[PDB]
């Protein structure tokens, strides 16, 4: 299974207080796409068939 | 270096063998009995619990006059009420686990009888030696 | 003219309790049971090597 | 107890006692400072002038 | 440049926050997923 | 089920009895000696302290050549300087607590004498056996 | 009060003496082996570690049939392969530390040989006694 988030996220540091750092999601570079996971259809089908048996 | 290895008598792997055959590997398990701030305390507690268990077993062995000996004969007669059987089928056919399962009921009375016999023997020996 | 504590961008300090004394006191280190502490009595010992006393 | 006829090899630099007692001192210092007052509110802007006194 | 299936999933949120000095405050912006913010009831 | 119970030799309840009469219940107390993150640590420390006390007592018994025996005679003579008395009034009239109170002064010298005698006996036995 | 003091056989201060001469002070060190929430736990762990070390040593002594004895002869022959030497130069010229340094290589095989010999002796004694 291949799980991917293709968004080019950026980390931004904010000083909340003394030695307190907060990491926030800054502007995304480029296109924005939904994170998705891929599996092999044939392999999943054969595994489901074995499970069914 | 001709293909040799260790071939050492290890853990309870011999438990499935017979009574007498498994009596070979008592000492290795006896030695294994002492194999060796929220998690270190728990592991230390486990170690201390194992230590108390082994020390209590040693104290029980010493109370029956069998300290320092893996095998120690005693003067308590073997009443046939517990399990009659016979010697031949015990030490050559039955395993240790089956024997423990069979005799698990009357262990405490055996311990008490061994205690009383050892105390009486100690007093009799003291009196006899003081006589000489 | 505006100034800030030097530590404000690093961490927050913990003021020491006034009743607590910073004066050093003699201390001894003792080995537990089963261990021993060896002292080299040689007056010309240079910190390493053999010691006969 | 003096050990007659005994020669021992000493090494000041590769001694575990020095590191161990350094760590012990650091931990004891931190433990002593733990119950004391936490000086976080001091991190505020200060108006400072010179001292002609 | 959000795809059709990512409409409203991401939200650009700006807010005030304390800085290293308590008396001072800073206005900062970030991005939060829709499953991390809830509306409170124009603006 | 005819009115029977336990009637077991328990705790120090026999301490008020005489010397010889109280010698019956030594082993039960010996067994009792091992009865069994701010409070668990304290109870674990108490358990470990009891363990060290019992183990130190066992080590002292072994050093005098009396390991594994509740009663063990020794080769050290009984000097009359400590408490002369006589045998009849000791084992039939005086209790264990009174004897401990009387002989509490010279315990360390007794321990040292037993130590030295056992060491000498061990060396003499080793030499005699090596002779054969 | 005529200038007397203690003059007690203390710590390893006798280690520099010869083999036989240093055998006098074995028991004092044996007794010393049990001398006695972020720091108390560490010191308790040190105490428990010392306890396990001593108890493991006692278990090893008991496994070889030498429990309760500082000196215990055994039936294992002394193979000359380890260190031939001779008796005269060992117990009168060499110290304990030098002997430990020399024989540090083959300690495990000695332990195993003593184990096997003691087990065989125990079984032979059990069979012989059951014969009578
Ligand atoms: C989430 O929402 C926040 C606000 O809440 C957005 O942050 C703002 O983003 C905009 C758009 O990029 C920023 O505006 C740009 O900022 C840059 C700096 O501008 C300087 O110069 C101008 C005057 O020239 C000053 O007013 C300004 O203060 C700065 O000193 C430049 O990239 C841009 O200027 C260029 O474009 C403009 C467009 O018209 C031209 O007029 C200019 O001449 C020049 O070519 C522009 O000003 C804005 O500054 C950001 N604000 C903050 C506080 O950061 C996030 O972008 C948004 N996130 C997402 C993912 O949408
Ligand atoms: C697990 O259980 C197995 C089945 O009981 C055990 O096998 C036994 O292994 C022992 C030795 O460990 C054998 O004892 C030997 O047996 C023969 C005696 O002759 C008889 O058996 C042979 C072969 O079965 C047969 O041809 C003859 O006619 C006799 O019936 C001799 O070699 C020796 O004297 C010795 O007694 C058992 O015979 C054997 N039992 C079998 C194969 O049923 C096995 O050892 C167990 N595993 C463990 C780890 O203990
Ligand atoms: C607490 O102390 C009590 C007082 O000493 C103990 O009572 C004693 O109990 C023992 C047995 O445990 C008795 O021993 C028996 O005594 C008689 C001997 O005859 C003499 O005593 C009787 C009755 O007092 C008297 O009639 C005779 O003339 C003699 O003087 C026989 O039955 C036996 O042979 C045996 O020796 C003591 O006599 C008795 N002492 C008394 C009553 O003063 C009591 O046991 C103690 N408690 C504990 C728990 O140890
Ligand atoms: C540290 O090592 C020292 C050197 O080996 C040890 O000194 C030895 O001490 C022992 C007693 O503990 C002596 O043994 C006695 O020696 C003589 C035998 O006569 C021979 O020696 C004398 C004096 O050296 C000499 O005049 C003669 O001609 C002989 O050569 C007798 O008094 C006794 O029978 C007994 O055997 C050693 O002789 C002595 N060795 C020396 C001085 O070289 C010292 O004890 C060691 N320290 C510890 C704490 O063990
Ligand atoms: C998981 O599977 C999906 C669906 O197959 C993959 O999405 C597909 O990815 C490929 C390769 O990047 C895309 O092809 C490319 O698309 C554009 C537009 O033509 C361009 O960059 C290239 O010329 C090329 O054709 C494809 O469009 C895209 N979508 C579909 C529906 O097939 C995805 O990449 C897979 N993820 C992983 C981690 O393997
Ligand atoms: C998940 O991603 C992995 C890589 O991270 C994919 O495995 C890769 O699949 C490609 C084809 O899509 C393989 O390339 C082909 O491989 C062989 C020779 O190795 C041959 O058929 C072709 O010449 C071509 O090069 C690639 O080797 C393979 N990599 C590994 C490490 O196995 C996988 O297919 C992805 N899974 C899904 C469900 O999309
Ligand atoms: C962060 O802090 C700033 C600074 O205090 C806040 O800005 C203030 O927001 C209030 C409420 O919207 C403003 O009051 C209104 O302003 C205008 C002009 O008078 C008008 O709509 C109303 O009559 C009302 O007075 C206030 O002026 C404004 N202050 C400044 C200096 O801009 C801000 O709301 C806080 N929060 C965020 C997320 O930025
Ligand atoms: C916290 O602030 C102090 C004081 O300004 C910083 O120390 C200075 O850092 C600058 C960085 O350009 C150096 O040029 C100066 O030489 C530093 N001054 C001294 C006295 O050391 C410090 O770097 C800041 N810390 C962080 C983590 O930003
Ligand atoms: C911004 O996104 C919001 C949602 O966060 C949009 O408002 C509606 O959201 C619901 C789901 O909550 C959708 O079904 C509607 O289609 C959305 N639109 C309307 C008009 O109701 C909102 O439209 C988006 N755009 C703006 C400019 O705020
Ligand atoms: C899976 O395999 C079966 C045969 O085993 C086939 O009939 C079917 O079309 C395949 N695909 C799915 C989605 O079931
Ligand atoms: C043990 O006793 C049983 C029951 O009487 C008998 O069948 C069996 O042969 C005996 N085993 C012997 C004598 O070895
Ligand atoms: C032990 O006692 C239980 C009841 O407590 C009984 O069911 C079991 O059969 C007994 N086992 C034997 C071996 O007598
Ligand atoms: C967003 O989309 C617009 C319209 O297609 C395009 O001109 C612009 O470059 C895009 N921005 C980014 C950052 O890709
Ligand atoms: C013990 O000695 C005392 C004091 O001489 C004497 O009175 C008493 O009878 C003795 N006890 C005996 C001999 O049992
Ligand atoms: C023990 O010694 C103390 C003084 O240390 C003395 O008062 C007491 O009488 C002594 N006890 C005996 C039984 O001699
Ligand atoms: C021990 O053996 C060596 C080497 O042969 C010899 O020189 C020495 O005299 C021997 N020691 C004795 C016999 O005491
Ligand atoms: C012990 O073995 C090491 C190598 O493991 C070797 O260097 C050393 O000489 C050996 N010692 C003895 C006394 O044989």
- CA–CA gap between residue A7 and residue A28 (Å, rounded): 7
Q: What angle do CA B119, B123, B124 make, to 5 degrees?
A: 115
In 3D, which of A14, F23, B8, A46 has the Cα closest to residue E16?
Answer: A14
Instruction: Tell me the count of B-G CB pairs closer than 8 A.
Output: 54
Phi, psi for residue A8 in degrees, rounded to 5: -85, 85
- CA–CA gap between residue F27 and residue E14 (Å, rounded): 78
- CA–CA gap between residue C9 and residue D43 (Å, rounded): 9
**CB–CB of G61/G67 below 8 Å?**
yes
Q: What angle do CA B3, B9, B10 make, to 5 degrees?
A: 105
- CA–CA gap between residue B22 and residue B9 (Å, rounded): 11
| Interruption sites in chain C after residues (C→N beyond 2.5 Å) | none
**Which strands sit side by side in the sheet containing E10-18, from one edge to the other?**
A11-17, A20-25, E25-33, E10-18
Whose tokens are 């066992």? That residue is F58
Q: Give the number of residues written for chain B.
A: 132
Judged by a CB distance cut-off of 8 A, whether residue A11 touches chain E is no
Residue of G nearest to F120 (CA): G24
Whose tokens are 């072994």? That residue is F62
What residues are paired with E26 via a beta bridge? E17
In 3D, which of G82, G128, G130 has the Cα closest to residue G108?
Answer: G82
- CA–CA gap between residue G50 and residue G34 (Å, rounded): 8
Exposure string for E15-41, b = 16+ CB within 10 A, e = fewer: eeeebbbbeeeeebebbeeeeeeeeee
> Is the alpha carbon torsion for G40, G42, G45, G46 positive or negative?
negative
Cβ count near G71 (within 10 Å):
12
> Residue G98, CB half-sphere, CA atoms under 13 Å: how many?
16
F29 C-alpha to ligand 3 centroid (Å): 25
Please state the atom number of ligand 4 nearest to the C-alpha of residue G17. 50
Structure tokens at E37: 């913010």
Structure tokens at B69: 């000996």
- CA–CA gap between residue G95 and residue G12 (Å, rounded): 12
**CB–CB of E23/E42 below 8 Å?**
no
Q: Give the number of residues written for chain E.
A: 43
Q: What is the resolution of this structure in A?
A: 3.5
Whose tokens are 């009168």? That residue is G92
Residue G96, SS3 per DSSP: helix
**CB–CB of G13/D4 below 8 Å?**
yes
CA distance G129 to chain C (A): 40
Exposure string for A18-50, b = 16+ CB within 10 A, e = fewer: beeeeebbeeeeeeeeeeeeeeeeeeeeeeeee
Residue D17 vs residues C31, C46, F120: alpha-carbon distances, Å: 11, 18, 40
- CA–CA gap between residue F47 and residue F56 (Å, rounded): 14
Bridge-based pairing of strands A36-38 and A2-4 is antiparallel
> Is the alpha carbon torsion for F39, F40, F44, F47 positive or negative?
positive
CA distance E10 to chain D (A): 35
**CB–CB of G62/F67 below 8 Å?**
no
Whose tokens are 């996220």? That residue is A9
User: Which listed ligand is nearest to G88 at the C-alpha?
Assistant: 16
In 3D, which of G92, G84, G95 has the Cα closest to residue G14?
Answer: G95
Q: For chain F, how big is the Rg over CA atoms in Å? A: 20
Residue E40 vs residues E13, E37, E43, F40: alpha-carbon distances, Å: 14, 10, 10, 47
- CA–CA gap between residue F58 and residue E43 (Å, rounded): 82
Residue C21 vs residues C14, D32, D38, G37, G95: alpha-carbon distances, Å: 16, 11, 18, 22, 50
Q: Is E29 in the pocket of ligand 7 (CB under 6 A)?
A: no
Residue of D nearest to G10 (CA): D1
Residue B56 vs residues B1, B49, B51, G64: alpha-carbon distances, Å: 45, 10, 8, 21
**CB–CB of A12/A24 below 8 Å?**
yes
Cβ count near B114 (within 10 Å):
20
**CB–CB of F110/F100 below 8 Å?**
no
Cβ count near G67 (within 10 Å):
20
- CA–CA gap between residue B81 and residue B75 (Å, rounded): 17
Judged by a CB distance cut-off of 8 A, whether residue B119 touches chain F is yes
Please state the atom number of ligand 1 nearest to the C-alpha of residue A27. 60
Measured between beta carbons, the chain C residues lying within 8 angstroms of G54 are 33-34
Bridge-based pairing of strands A11-17 and A20-25 is antiparallel
Structure tokens at C32: 């537990």
- CA–CA gap between residue B56 and residue B79 (Å, rounded): 26
**CB–CB of B41/F45 below 8 Å?**
no
Q: For atom 4 of ligand 17, which residue has the closest CA?
A: G105
- Inter-chain residue contact G43 with C33, CB threshold 8 Å: no
Phi, psi for residue G90 in degrees, rounded to 5: -80, -55
Neighbours of chain D (3+ CB pairs under 8 A): A, C, E, G
Instruction: Measure CA of the first residue to CA of the last residue in chain E; give whole Å.
Output: 24
Cβ count near A17 (within 10 Å):
19
Chain mean position to CA F103:
14
**CB–CB of D27/G38 below 8 Å?**
yes
| Interruption sites in chain B after residues (C→N beyond 2.5 Å) | 36
Phi, psi for residue E40 in degrees, rounded to 5: -125, 130
What residues are paired with A25 via a beta bridge? A11, E31
**CB–CB of C24/C11 below 8 Å?**
no
F58 class by beta-carbon count within 10 Å (0-12 exposed, 13-18 middle, 19+ buried): buried
- CA–CA gap between residue F25 and residue F11 (Å, rounded): 8
Residue B96, SS3 per DSSP: helix
What residues are paired with A3 via a beta bridge? A37
Interface-testing mutation among B22, B27, B32, B73, with chain G (most G C-beta atoms within 10 A):
B27
- CA–CA gap between residue E17 and residue A15 (Å, rounded): 9
Structure tokens at B113: 């009888």
E6 class by beta-carbon count within 10 Å (0-12 exposed, 13-18 middle, 19+ buried): middle
Contacts of F51 (CB under 8 A, 6+ apart): B48, B51, B52, B55, F34, G51
**CB–CB of G25/F119 below 8 Å?**
no
Please state the atom number of ligand 1 nearest to the C-alpha of residue E14. 5
**CB–CB of G110/G63 below 8 Å?**
no
**CB–CB of E28/E19 below 8 Å?**
no
In 3D, which of C31, G43, G118, C6 has the Cα closest to residue E20?
Answer: C6
Contacts of G130 (CB under 8 A, 6+ apart): B73
Judged by a CB distance cut-off of 8 A, whether residue B109 touches chain F is no
Phi, psi for residue C36 in degrees, rounded to 5: -130, 155
B118 class by beta-carbon count within 10 Å (0-12 exposed, 13-18 middle, 19+ buried): buried
F131 C-alpha to ligand 13 centroid (Å): 105
- CA–CA gap between residue D22 and residue D13 (Å, rounded): 14
Chain mean position to CA E37:
8
In 3D, which of F67, D1, F114 has the Cα closest to residue C53?
Answer: D1
- Which helix (DSSP H) or strand (DSSP E) does residue G47 occupy? helix G40-63
D36 C-alpha to ligand 8 centroid (Å): 28
Measured between beta carbons, the chain A residues lying within 8 angstroms of C12 are 17-19
What residues are paired with D10 via a beta bridge? C49
- Inter-chain residue contact B52 with F41, CB threshold 8 Å: no
- Inter-chain residue contact C5 with D43, CB threshold 8 Å: yes
Residue B42 region by backbone torsions, left for phi larger than 0, else alpha for psi between -120 and 50, else beta: alpha
- The DSSP code for D37 is P
Residue B51 vs residues C19, D52, F48, G61: alpha-carbon distances, Å: 44, 72, 10, 17
- Residue to probe by mutation, ligand 12, list B84, B104, B105, most atoms within 8 Å of CB: B105
- CA–CA gap between residue B71 and residue G124 (Å, rounded): 11
Q: Which pairs from G3-10 meet CB under 8 Å and 24+ separation?
A: G10/D1
In 3D, which of B36, G101, G23 has the Cα closest to residue F120?
Answer: G23
- CA–CA gap between residue F71 and residue B106 (Å, rounded): 29
**CB–CB of F56/F37 below 8 Å?**
no
- Inter-chain residue contact G119 with B24, CB threshold 8 Å: yes
**CB–CB of E30/A28 below 8 Å?**
no
């Amino acid at each position: 299974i291949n799980c991917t988030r293709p968004n080019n996220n950026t980390r931004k540091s904010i000083r909340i207080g003394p030695g307190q750092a907060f990491y926030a999601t800054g502007d995304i570079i480029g296109d924005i796409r939904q994170a998705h996971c891929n599996v092999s259809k044939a392999t999943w089908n054969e595994t489901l068939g074995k499970v069914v048996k | 270096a001709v293909g040799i290895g260790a071939v050492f008598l290890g853990f309870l792997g011999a438990a499935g063998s017979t009574m007498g055959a498994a009596s070979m590997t008592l000492t290795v398990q006896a030695r294994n009995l002492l194999s060796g701030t929220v998690w270190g305390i728990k592991q230390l507690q486990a170690r201390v619990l194992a230590v108390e268990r082994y020390l209590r077993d040693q104290q029980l062995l010493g109370i029956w006059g069998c300290s320092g000996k893996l095998i120690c004969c005693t003067n308590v007669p073997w009443n046939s009420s517990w399990s009659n059987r016979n010697l031949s089928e015990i030490w050559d056919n039955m395993t240790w686990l089956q024997w423990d399962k069979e005799i698990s009921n009357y262990t405490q009375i055996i311990y008490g009888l061994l205690e009383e016999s050892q105390n009486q023997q100690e007093k009799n020996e003291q009196d006899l030696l003081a006589l000489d | 003219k505006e100034y800030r504590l030097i530590n404000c961008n690093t961490s927050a300090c913990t003021q020491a309790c006034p009743k607590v004394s910073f004066e050093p006191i003699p201390i001894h280190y003792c080995a537990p049971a089963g261990f021993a502490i060896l002292k080299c009595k040689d007056k010309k010992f240079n910190g390493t090597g053999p010691c006969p006393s | 107890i003096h050990l007659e006829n005994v020669t021992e090899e000493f090494n000041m630099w590769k001694n575990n006692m020095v590191e161990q007692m350094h760590t012990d001192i650091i931990s004891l210092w931190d433990q002593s400072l733990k119950p004391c007052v936490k000086l976080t509110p001091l991190c505020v802007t200060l108006q400072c002038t010179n001292v002609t006194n | 440049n959000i795809t059709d299936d990512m409409r409203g999933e991401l939200k650009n949120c700006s807010f005030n926050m304390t800085t290293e000095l308590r008396d001072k405050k800073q206005k900062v912006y970030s991005l939060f997923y829709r499953l991390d913010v809830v509306q409170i009831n124009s603006n």
